[PDB]
Amino acid sequence: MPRYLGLMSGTSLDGMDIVLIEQGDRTTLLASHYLPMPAGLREDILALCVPGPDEIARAAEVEQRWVALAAQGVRELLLQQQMSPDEVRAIGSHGQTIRHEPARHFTVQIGNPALLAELTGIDVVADFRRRDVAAGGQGAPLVPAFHQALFGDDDTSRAVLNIGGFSNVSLLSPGKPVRGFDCGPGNVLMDAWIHHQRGEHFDRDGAWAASGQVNHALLASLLADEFFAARGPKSTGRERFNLPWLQEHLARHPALPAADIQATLLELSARSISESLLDAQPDCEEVLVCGGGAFNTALMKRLAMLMPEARVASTDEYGIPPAWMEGMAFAWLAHRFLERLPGNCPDVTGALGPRTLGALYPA
Amino acid sequence: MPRYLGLMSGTSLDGMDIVLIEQGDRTTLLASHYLPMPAGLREDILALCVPGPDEIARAAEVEQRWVALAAQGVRELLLQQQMSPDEVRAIGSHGQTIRHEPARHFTVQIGNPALLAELTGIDVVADFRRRDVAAGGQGAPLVPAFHQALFGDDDTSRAVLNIGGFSNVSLLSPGKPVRGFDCGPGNVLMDAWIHHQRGEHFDRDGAWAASGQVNHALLASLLADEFFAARGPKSTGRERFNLPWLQEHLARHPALPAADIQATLLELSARSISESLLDAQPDCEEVLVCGGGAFNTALMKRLAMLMPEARVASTDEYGIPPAWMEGMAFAWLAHRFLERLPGNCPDVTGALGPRTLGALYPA
Ligand SMILES: Nc1ncnc2c1ncn2[C@@H]1O[C@H](COP(=O)(O)OP(=O)(O)O)[C@@H](O)[C@H]1O
Ligand SMILES: Nc1ncnc2c1ncn2[C@@H]1O[C@H](COP(=O)(O)OP(=O)(O)O)[C@@H](O)[C@H]1O
Ligand SMILES: CC(=O)N[C@@H]1[C@@H](O[C@H](C)C(=O)O)[C@H](O)[C@@H](COP(=O)(O)O)O[C@@H]1O
Numbered sequence: 051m052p053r054y055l056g057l058m059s060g061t062s063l064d065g066m067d068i069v070l071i072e073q074g075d076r077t078t079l080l081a082s083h084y085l086p087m088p089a090g091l092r093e094d095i096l097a098l099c100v101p102g103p104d105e106i107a108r109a110a111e112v113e114q115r116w117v118a119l120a121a122q123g124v125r126e127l128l129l130q131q132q133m134s135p136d137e138v139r140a141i142g143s144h145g146q147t148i149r150h151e152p153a154r155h156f157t158v159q160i161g162n163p164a165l166l167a168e169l170t171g172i173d174v175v176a177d178f179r180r181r182d183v184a185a186g187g188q189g190a191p192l193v194p195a196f197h198q199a200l201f202g203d204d205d206t207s208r209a210v211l212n213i214g215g216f217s218n219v220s221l222l223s224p225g226k227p228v229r230g231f232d233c234g235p236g237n238v239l240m241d242a243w244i245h246h247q248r249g250e251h252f253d254r255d256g257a258w259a260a261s262g263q264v265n266h267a268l269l270a271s272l273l274a275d276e277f278f279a280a281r282g283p284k285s286t287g288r289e290r291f292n293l294p295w296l297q298e299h300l301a302r303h304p305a306l307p308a309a310d311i312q313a314t315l316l317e318l319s320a321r322s323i324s325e326s327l328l329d330a331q332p333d334c335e336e337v338l339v340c341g342g343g344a345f346n347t348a349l350m351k352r353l354a355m356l357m358p359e360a361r362v363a364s365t366d367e368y369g370i371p372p373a374w375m376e377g378m379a380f381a382w383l384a385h386r387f388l389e390r391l392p393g394n395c396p397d398v399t400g401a402l403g404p405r406t407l408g409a410l411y412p413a
Numbered sequence: 414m415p416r417y418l419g420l421m422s423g424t425s426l427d428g429m430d431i432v433l434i435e436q437g438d439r440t441t442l443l444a445s446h447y448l449p450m451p452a453g454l455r456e457d458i459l460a461l462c463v464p465g466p467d468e469i470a471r472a473a474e475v476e477q478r479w480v481a482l483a484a485q486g487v488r489e490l491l492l493q494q495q496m497s498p499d500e501v502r503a504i505g506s507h508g509q510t511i512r513h514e515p516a517r518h519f520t521v522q523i524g525n526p527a528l529l530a531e532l533t534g535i536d537v538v539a540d541f542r543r544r545d546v547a548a549g550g551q552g553a554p555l556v557p558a559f560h561q562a563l564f565g566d567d568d569t570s571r572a573v574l575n576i577g578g579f580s581n582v583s584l585l586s587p588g589k590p591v592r593g594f595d596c597g598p599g600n601v602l603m604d605a606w607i608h609h610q611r612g613e614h615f616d617r618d619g620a621w622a623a624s625g626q627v628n629h630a631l632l633a634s635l636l637a638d639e640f641f642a643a644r645g646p647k648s649t650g651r652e653r654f655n656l657p658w659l660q661e662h663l664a665r666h667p668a669l670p671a672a673d674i675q676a677t678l679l680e681l682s683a684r685s686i687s688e689s690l691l692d693a694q695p696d697c698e699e700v701l702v703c704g705g706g707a708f709n710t711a712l713m714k715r716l717a718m719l720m721p722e723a724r725v726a727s728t729d730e731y732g733i734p735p736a737w738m739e740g741m742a743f744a745w746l747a748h749r750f751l752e753r754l755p756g757n758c759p760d761v762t763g764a765l766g767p768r769t770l771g772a773l774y775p776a
């Protein structure tokens with residue numbers, strides 16, 4: 051019954067997820083701890099997601115504040131759980147993606163794991179993505195293995211679907227190796243648009259999206275990106291799908307209401323997920339939705355209707371809160387590293403084969 | 414009787430040292446292998462040593478080339494020694510420093526250890542300084558503990574003096590715990606000056622230096638830099654001692670012949686060493702010189718003259734070739750990581766205490 055911490059901080063930059071798990075015969079969630087991202091740090095992370103000056107100095111100092119916050123949250127969670135650091139075997143830390151360039155064969159995650167070990171007094175397993183990339187893979191997604199271990203079922207063809215900043219799906223097909231790929235944007239554009247407009251961080255329950263009307267021509271134009279055509283191992287991020295990208299599409303088209311664009315963005319996510327998922331697993335019987343997109347009532351409804359042959363529900367029904375799936379997954383990967391068990395799925399990432407993912411920074 | 418690889422590429426940027434050692438009852442050098450740094454790569458690393466644009470993307474691509482070259486070298490050495498990589502327990506990789514800012518509490522060594530593990534098929538231990546910096550230390554020097562393991566003679570006092578781009582000394586005073594610090598510039602300015610003048614990489618045997626004559630006024634002004642005044646834990650780099658820095662001193666005084674300036678730079682190194690060393694260890698009886706500075710005949714004689722109470726010889730006289738000392742140290746630090754033994758020295762670095770240095774990237 052070794053206990054592990056998982057630290058995830060996704061591209062939505064909403065905040066830091068910290069989970070505690072017990073890894074026995076099955077993965078149990080013991081506790082969760084959410085740290086909202088400070089305004090300043092969120093914006094400084096966003097400033098590192100595009101090319102710019104003095105990045106090495108800037109990232110180091112952003113890194114220091116990120117780790118300091120992570121260690122604060124870990125300390126908080128342990129005290130509130132009446133357990134010491136000694137009772138935790140290791141922290142699994144994803145870090146923070148500031149650049150993802152699989153075409154150029156690199157992915158950049160910050161989160162100085164040495165400093166995280168020093169501050170927490172706990173062994174840290176981190177930097178899980180770079181060995182997969184080194185093995186020719188996309189480096190993303192890395193949860194499918196975990197999704198397999200949780201929800202691997204012979205009797206059903208399940209698709210486990212994360213909807214964070216970006217969407218990604220794990221295809222659990224009886225008989226066949228685990229498949230998976232980034233579907234496209236999840237909340238990233240819906241958040242970015244309501245931020246450029248107005249100045250909010252996200253659209254609660256997708257209520258602003260539901261107030262507007264879809265523009266079918268715009269939808270067509272957005273779906274005409276090369277990434278949606280591509281199949282098999284692929285990944286994406288803020289490099290491709292961002293506000294500039296959207297504005298470039300809005301330029302050639304005429305002027306539309308802002309809510310209609312938001313509605314179009316919701317549909318863009320629903321349709322990209324639906325069509326890419328159903329292309330890969332037309333036999334799908336259950337879509338299990340995790341990540342913060344699970345809480346979007348407008349989005350979830352649309353997925354159910356665009357995939358009528360499937361039962362679309364969040365992972366809550368199956369015992370695991372959708373908020374903490376990624377955090378639990380990286381806790382699990384620290385386990386996998388310490389037992390020398392493969393981290394990646396080759397037919398997900400496109401790597402040469404299975405690889406032990408991560409590096410060990412001991413306390 | 415495990416075998417380790419040591420990989421070191423210092424601030425001189427002359428090339429990559431690859432050593433193979435055995436760590437039985439003591440450290441034995443089995444083989445060495447030097448890789449001249451390609452011109453293109455040397456200049457791109459140098460371009461990352463000052464603030465600039467698009468550093469994260471640039472550093473990543475430079476990193477891949479660095480690692481590709483390191484892996485090539487490792488392959489070449491093993492084949493030439495008729496060895497499988499199965500027979501090597503791990504590689505200790507220093508990586509390549511492109512920024513050293515202890516004051517801002519960060520230091521940046523590139524060398525994607527995950528890719529290095531991928532390409533060599535051997536477990537990599539890397540990223541040694543960061544944990545010392547995390548512990549409130551300078552992060553440099555890191556060799557003193559090795560120096561103590563090799564040349565820890567209690568009957569006699571002695572200082573082990575590495576002269577690379579930068580000079581650093583390990584003070585081995587019988588009974589008293591190990592101390593050390595960066596003395597200042599070793600070859601870095603002498604290299605930088607002749608490069609600026611003639612394009613050459615270094616001054617062979619200090620012949621150019623030896624053809625010129627020391628200028629008193631310039632020397633005084635060079636010795637005036639505050640770094641030389643400071644005592645105890647120190648570290649420095651190209652951030653302080655560089656050609657721009659030198660030219661601030663040149664401009665102040667009238668024009669000098671180029672060779673006289675070179676003569677003066679040789680004197681600057683010897684005096685900053687000799688005075689910092691004996692200040693901290695006045696009883697010094699022996700100066701074991703390692704690093705490429707040991708090959709500078711003019712420098713070695715001048716060190717002898719300034720320190721006549723002690724013998725000044727290279728480490729070759731006591732078993733170890735002066736070129737491979739650092740490479741051997743990092744292989745040793747791999748051994749020290751894997752046994753969970755401290756690799757830093759608080760009374761050298763200023764860190765809160767003894768720490769395991771490095772991170773394990775398994776093959
Ligand atoms: N009640 C909600 N209604 C709609 N969207 C929501 C709601 N709560 C959270 N979200 C979305 O979930 C996102 C966070 O999802 P998350 O899984 O943390 O993504 P990431 O891992 O990329 O940070 C927010 O940016 C937001 O768009
Ligand atoms: N024959 C020589 N004569 C004088 N200086 C030399 C000679 N060979 C090497 N050097 C000096 O040694 C330096 C390399 O020393 P090294 O120990 O590799 O330092 P670093 O760790 O900074 O790379 C060169 O830059 C040069 O100044
Ligand atoms: C941050 C950094 O890169 N420091 C190095 C450091 O290198 C050696 C390996 C050490 O860690 O002890 C040393 O202080 C000095 C002289 O050694 P070399 O120039 O021969 O490498 O160089 C640089 O300051």
Ligand SMILES: CC(=O)N[C@H]1[C@@H]2OC[C@@H](O2)[C@@H](O)[C@@H]1O[C@H](C)C(=O)O
Binds near residue numbers: 212
């Ligand atoms: C490079 C990167 O950070 N990718 C993220 C991102 O956010 C969701 C999706 O794109 C996924 O591929 C991945 O995160 C999850 C945890 C994963 O690796 O499965």
